Design a binder for this molecule. Sequence first.
Ligand SMILES: [Zn+2]
Length: 151
Amino acid sequence: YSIEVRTHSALHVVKGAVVKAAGSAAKWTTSTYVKGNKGVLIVKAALELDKWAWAAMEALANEKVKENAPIKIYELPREEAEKMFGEDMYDLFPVPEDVRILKVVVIEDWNVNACNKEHTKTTGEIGPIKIRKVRFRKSKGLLEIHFELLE
Ligand SMILES: [Zn+2]
């Protein structure tokens, strides 16, 4: 696999970790990016989290990785997808109304996201995930998770 394919799959794993560590008050992604072996996940955060969160997120992310869980894909009609997954599968960008069929990524009881990119078949292929930075921006109610993979 491409390092960026892996880093991108890691976004899904890391997102799930953030939600598990912080609950549903940090579950809406505003934006993300992948550059080589590095990725950044930014989510809306209603609350500042405790001193254990950063470490908790990294631990949870890596645990999901060794679990080597399958990264499922459902390519369904938009209406069926929305019924099956709800608004949860969307990020905070608009998905043109003419897109009537969605590819949605599912890591069972971890993360659900409408995404048309390539992914690893399982979480184990991602390798160790390292979170070198977590920045909470109080006034904007935004939480940034910076992480990186091994090439
Ligand atoms: Zn994706």
